[PDB]
Amino acid sequence: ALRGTVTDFSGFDGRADAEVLEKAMKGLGTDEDSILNLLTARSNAQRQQIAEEFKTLFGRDLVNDMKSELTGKFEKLIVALMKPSRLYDAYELKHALKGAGTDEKVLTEIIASRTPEELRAIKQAYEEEYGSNLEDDVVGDTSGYYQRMLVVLLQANRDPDTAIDDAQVELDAQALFQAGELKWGTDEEKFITILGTRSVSHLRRVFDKYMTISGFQIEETIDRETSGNLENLLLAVVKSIRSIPAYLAETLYYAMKGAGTDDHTLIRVIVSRSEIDLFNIRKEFRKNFATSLYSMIKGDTSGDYKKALLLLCGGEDD
Ligand SMILES: [Ca+2]
Ligand SMILES: [Ca+2]
């Protein structure tokens, strides 16, 4: 299996669903319920058919109009809900790099989080859409071993998943053992090289062997051994490896946790995974935090914003 939460319509009519729109934003005010009930109700390919049928009919661009009547959160939510699938990520990514600064967590997230197949297909979109080389921008903004780890990930050449070579698992585990724990300092290049290049089906075994031998979790060593963004990045990598759904759920669980709430991430993940594996991510919530995501979300958000996320999300019982 491998599930998502948003799917295509049983019997879709874009020309109709389009008219529910001018009716929704017409005159003064706005029916912020009709729209959130119709977009979260439609897949993404569909959202786009709708988007054209709108233009074809009223000679208008829907995102432009929507952006003119929705504000702040929902608005951020509906925009990021209409962004084409294939480009959404590069979009997020592109957003992350600007400024003499940059938003690493976002970078760490998607790159560490996305498969080679994904990363590859991303690098293209980004290029065709922003006229620059993804990798080039990254390095333009990142640094140190953080940078290189990312760059290595960008290469989307993680070894394939074949049969298991215990020797290599033993060889690699040991390797990682001598690199940090048994080294007065660290051999960052070694983690980057094993962590970013080995087939997942492999690394997971290394992870267990590493437990046996040192008596620590590869993550633990990372904490003790490393620091800085380099840390968070190896963490996500290691985590995504074990289970992306998992890594991700933990991402959400932190964006709501404690005082306030992190929307950019809440939306991002929520949206981005909706049609891919959001159902799964949800399963790594009931189990890993004793609470279903639905509730968490429901208690941290409000208004239409909340209403929508809870429709995208779903799963109350769980
Ligand atoms: Ca209006
Ligand atoms: Ca050490």
From Swiss-Prot:
<dbReference type="GO" id="GO:0030425">
    <property type="term" value="C:dendrite"/>
</dbReference>
<dbReference type="GO" id="GO:0005544">
    <property type="term" value="F:calcium-dependent phospholipid binding"/>
</dbReference>
<dbReference type="GO" id="GO:0005388">
    <property type="term" value="F:P-type calcium transporter activity"/>
</dbReference>
<dbReference type="GO" id="GO:0005737">
    <property type="term" value="C:cytoplasm"/>
</dbReference>
<keyword id="KW-0702">S-nitrosylation</keyword>
<dbReference type="GO" id="GO:0009897">
    <property type="term" value="C:external side of plasma membrane"/>
</dbReference>
<feature type="modified residue" description="N6-acetyllysine">
    <location>
        <position position="76"/>
    </location>
</feature>
<feature type="cross-link" description="Glycyl lysine isopeptide (Lys-Gly) (interchain with G-Cter in SUMO2); alternate">
    <location>
        <position position="26"/>
    </location>
</feature>
<dbReference type="InterPro" id="IPR018252">
    <property type="entry name" value="Annexin_repeat_CS"/>
</dbReference>
<feature type="modified residue" description="N6-acetyllysine">
    <location>
        <position position="98"/>
    </location>
</feature>
<keyword id="KW-0832">Ubl conjugation</keyword>
<feature type="repeat" description="Annexin 1">
    <location>
        <begin position="12"/>
        <end position="83"/>
    </location>
</feature>
<keyword id="KW-0007">Acetylation</keyword>
<comment type="similarity">
    <text>Belongs to the annexin family.</text>
</comment>
<feature type="short sequence motif" description="[IL]-x-C-x-x-[DE] motif">
    <location>
        <begin position="311"/>
        <end position="317"/>
    </location>
</feature>
<keyword id="KW-0677">Repeat</keyword>
<feature type="repeat" description="Annexin 4">
    <location>
        <begin position="243"/>
        <end position="314"/>
    </location>
</feature>
<dbReference type="GO" id="GO:0030672">
    <property type="term" value="C:synaptic vesicle membrane"/>
</dbReference>
<keyword id="KW-0094">Blood coagulation</keyword>
<keyword id="KW-0597">Phosphoprotein</keyword>
<dbReference type="GO" id="GO:0042383">
    <property type="term" value="C:sarcolemma"/>
</dbReference>
<dbReference type="GO" id="GO:0043204">
    <property type="term" value="C:perikaryon"/>
</dbReference>
<dbReference type="GO" id="GO:0071284">
    <property type="term" value="P:cellular response to lead ion"/>
</dbReference>
<dbReference type="GO" id="GO:0008021">
    <property type="term" value="C:synaptic vesicle"/>
</dbReference>
<keyword id="KW-0106">Calcium</keyword>
<dbReference type="InterPro" id="IPR002392">
    <property type="entry name" value="ANX5"/>
</dbReference>
<dbReference type="GO" id="GO:0072563">
    <property type="term" value="C:endothelial microparticle"/>
</dbReference>
<dbReference type="GO" id="GO:0030195">
    <property type="term" value="P:negative regulation of blood coagulation"/>
</dbReference>
<dbReference type="InterPro" id="IPR001464">
    <property type="entry name" value="Annexin"/>
</dbReference>
<dbReference type="InterPro" id="IPR018502">
    <property type="entry name" value="Annexin_repeat"/>
</dbReference>
<comment type="subunit">
    <text>Monomer. Binds ATRX, EIF5B and DNMT1.</text>
</comment>
<dbReference type="GO" id="GO:1901317">
    <property type="term" value="P:regulation of flagellated sperm motility"/>
</dbReference>
<feature type="modified residue" description="Phosphoserine">
    <location>
        <position position="34"/>
    </location>
</feature>
<comment type="function">
    <text>This protein is an anticoagulant protein that acts as an indirect inhibitor of the thromboplastin-specific complex, which is involved in the blood coagulation cascade.</text>
</comment>
<dbReference type="GO" id="GO:0043025">
    <property type="term" value="C:neuronal cell body"/>
</dbReference>
<dbReference type="GO" id="GO:0017046">
    <property type="term" value="F:peptide hormone binding"/>
</dbReference>
<dbReference type="Pfam" id="PF00191">
    <property type="entry name" value="Annexin"/>
</dbReference>
<dbReference type="GO" id="GO:0043065">
    <property type="term" value="P:positive regulation of apoptotic process"/>
</dbReference>
<dbReference type="GO" id="GO:0042802">
    <property type="term" value="F:identical protein binding"/>
</dbReference>
<feature type="repeat" description="Annexin 2">
    <location>
        <begin position="84"/>
        <end position="155"/>
    </location>
</feature>
<dbReference type="GO" id="GO:0097211">
    <property type="term" value="P:cellular response to gonadotropin-releasing hormone"/>
</dbReference>
<feature type="modified residue" description="N6-acetyllysine">
    <location>
        <position position="67"/>
    </location>
</feature>
